[PDB]
Write an enzyme that holds these catalytic residues in place. Structure first.
Site, PDB file in Angstrom:
ATOM      1  NE  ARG A 110     -24.465  26.146  -6.081  1.00 42.47           N
ATOM      2  CZ  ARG A 110     -23.983  25.579  -5.379  1.00 42.47           C
ATOM      3  NH1 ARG A 110     -23.058  25.120  -6.830  1.00 42.47           N
ATOM      4  NH2 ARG A 110     -23.886  24.253  -5.062  1.00 42.47           N
ATOM      5  CG  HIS A 123     -19.123  22.703  -1.391  1.00 42.65           C
ATOM      6  ND1 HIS A 123     -19.429  22.129  -2.491  1.00 42.65           N
ATOM      7  CD2 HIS A 123     -18.867  22.138  -0.284  1.00 42.65           C
ATOM      8  CE1 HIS A 123     -18.687  20.323  -2.373  1.00 42.65           C
ATOM      9  NE2 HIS A 123     -18.158  20.695  -1.399  1.00 42.65           N
TER      10      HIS A 123
END
Lengths: 201, 49, 241, 239, 49
Positions: A110, A123
């Site tokens: 991320r 996710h």
């Protein structure tokens, strides 16, 4: 769980629509780390399909911007198998809030591929039951361990299926049509408790 | 206003040299598009790097 | 480049532009069928041609069923008559450390070291260096038996399109996963991966030994390689990289 | 033939010699890439050529996941603009039997024997595909799902059973297909080999102009028909 | 005397006709043997059947 059986756990890797065009480099990262690709699905997540996928988070938290974000482009979903797949996927993935994760975990996924909270890089599933629910919703008819042997599956049929099967087999006896697979299939597609009645014209 | 690239490409192959037929014909078609785009008196294939 | 698929391999269309004439092509089909006859080889690959200075050095290799032995390579001048080259060792390949440059024509040219250095031994030792350093094997073409005998994979598909661009999906065709990967390379970035005709071709052009061309398509069954070049090692490579 | 065999220029090397041009080789490569793009075919094959009088017909075929499905064949004149031919029925098959004459070109041509030129092209295409289309042994695997897939572990045909003639099937609805030994009349296939044992050449004689290449050691096969566009019923007089 | 049948073969592939490049070269070599065997003034490729 026991000695002559084994537990190959699974997790879901989600590729967000901002980063789907850069899929080969992150695929090199996830294959080189040790995670294996079971099956990859290139799926367009509908706005009316994202809510049933996210009843766990969106059903109690008001966030429609991420629901509009999942419909903005393609979504790649993959199943991963690894020794300690959840813990190593959380370690390589890192925590959320990628503005803070750009400073706290600079080697995470991320920090490089992400921008903010709602425009996330990826996710991942958190719990094993959540992983099972996510895999069972997105992916086709695959088998997820453990197989619920014994009284676990019998209770599932006896409180999910067999009332409807008892009501089907009650009307199937009177009268008796030849080749009763037609009558049972038409009864199950007609007198469905979870599906509404259909009337073509 | 192009020169005949195709006989030159036939003479390329006898030396064991060049793009064969398909890649040099796509080169010749790109040369045709370049000559149709710009007012070029002589547009010959210099070669490849 | 396999002898049974020389016309079935895009040689001039590979992008290197150093291929063959129809004369040299028909000579390779007939002569490689001949060296498949009289030399008992399991399969014969056309290795490539060295350009030289006054004549061309056409090189072909033959392999036994063991598939990992040193190759009994062959050479020709007029590309029609082929004869065996002597086997190479490290002490004989050490001998040309005091000479450099291209090599020309007949094998009877004596080079100054004064020990007279033959053209033929320099040629076969240079063939050994190009075989050892470059001319990679693709992944999945060589599977492993419990014994020392390696078989070529008849069920080789074997490279997906996501693994085409990667360095780690190519191993060195050299006895040493199975073999040494291409990420064990010095310098870092000594191979040019290049996309021709979309996904229907990839070239792994060697820069340490130019102009070596590695021959795909994916979904295939070729699985080939060819070196046509000046013949000496590119020691200039880290400056231009 | 696929576009891979269009890259190797294997129509001329089969020996039929009507062949193809690098014009049409590059045009079929780019345009069949377009045909695979716009229509979602599993595989797209250049079917071949129908010989003309004012323009040349170029035919390609597309296939679905089921390999024995009815194909969506296509035609093109300037080798870039591919257009979808309609499927053929038997009513159009017995319609064109009263027209005997060469394929002309300009597809809005009308026959006085009205009868459209495109209907003749489509019925001729279905006749050739039902008669002399060729699949070797083990090239197609009958899946138990009911569909036919390409056998991807197809080892090529060994040299012992190249000349039987019981090792070549048809690319239509019927080792689950009908062999070449039951073709009417017998001996209606030109059995041939190329230089060495590198390629096997089969030429149809019920339709003069189809050529089937087959490398006996690799997975290379396909049929191209370039020829007159006529079924000669003179073939028993020839043999 | 042998005619220029290889450039004529390139003209054949430009028209799309022909046996291929290596087969036309092979026919050229067979015609070279035919010219070297018999005292022939003109030995051109009539074609193949």
């Amino acid at each position: 769980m026991p000695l002559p059986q084994i537990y190959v756990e699974k997790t879901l890797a989600l590729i967000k629509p901002d980063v789907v065009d850069k899929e080969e480099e992150i695929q090199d990262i996830i294959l080189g780390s040790g995670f294996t690709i079971i099956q990859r699905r290139k799926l367009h997540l509908s706005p009316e399909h994202c809510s049933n996928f996210y009843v766990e988070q969106y059903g109690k938290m008001f966030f429609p911007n991420l629901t509009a974000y999942m419909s903005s482009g393609p979504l790649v979903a993959m199943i991963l198998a690894r020794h300690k797949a959840i813990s190593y996927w959380k370690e390589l993935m890192g925590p959320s809030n990628s503005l803070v994760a750009k400073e706290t975990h600079p080697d995470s996924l991320r920090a490089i591929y992400g921008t903010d909270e709602l425009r996330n890089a990826l996710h991942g599933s958190n719990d094993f039951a959540a992983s099972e629910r996510e895999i069972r919703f997105m992916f086709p008819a695959v088998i997820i361990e453990p197989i619920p042997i014994g009284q676990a599956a019998k209770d599932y049929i006896n409180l999910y299926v067999a009332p409807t099967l008892l009501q089907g087999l009650t009307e199937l006896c009177k009268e008796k049509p030849p080749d009763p697979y037609l009558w049972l299939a038409d009864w199950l597609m007609k007198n469905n408790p979870n599906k509404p009645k259909l009337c073509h014209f | 206003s192009l020169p005949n690239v195709m006989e030159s490409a036939y003479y390329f192959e006898q030396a064991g040299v060049g793009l064969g037929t398909d890649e040099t014909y796509r080169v010749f078609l790109a040369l045709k598009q370049l000559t149709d785009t710009h007012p070029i008196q002589r547009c010959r294939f210099w070669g490849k790097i | 480049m396999d002898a049974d698929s020389l016309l079935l391999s895009l040689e001039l269309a590979s992008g290197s532009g150093q291929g063959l004439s129809p004369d040299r092509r028909a000579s390779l089909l007939t002569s490689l069928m001949l060296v498949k006859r009289d030399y008992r080889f399991a399969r014969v690959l056309f290795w490539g041609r060295i350009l030289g200075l006054v004549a061309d050095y056409y090189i072909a290799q033959g392999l036994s069923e063991d598939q990992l032995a040193p190759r009994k390579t062959l050479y020709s001048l007029n590309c029609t008559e082929w004869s065996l080259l002597p086997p190479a060792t490290e002490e004989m390949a050490m001998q040309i450390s005091v000479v450099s440059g291209r090599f020309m024509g007949d094998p009877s040219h004596e080079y100054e070291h004064v020990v007279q250095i033959k053209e033929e031994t320099r040629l076969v030792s240079i063939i050994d260096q190009i075989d050892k350093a470059v001319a990679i094997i693709p992944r999945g073409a060589l599977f492993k038996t419990p014994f020392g005998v390696t078989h070529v994979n008849r069920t080789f598909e074997g490279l997906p399109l996501s693994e085409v661009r990667k360095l780690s999906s190519y191993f060195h065709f050299r006895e040493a996963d199975f073999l040494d990967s291409l990420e064990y390379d010095i310098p870092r970035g000594s191979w040019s991966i290049q996309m021709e005709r979309g996904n229907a071709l990839v070239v792994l052009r060697s820069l340490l030994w130019p102009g070596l061309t590695f021959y795909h398509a994916p979904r295939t069954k070729n699985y080939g390689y060819i070196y046509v070049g000046t013949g000496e090692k590119n020691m200039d490579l880290p400056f231009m990289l």
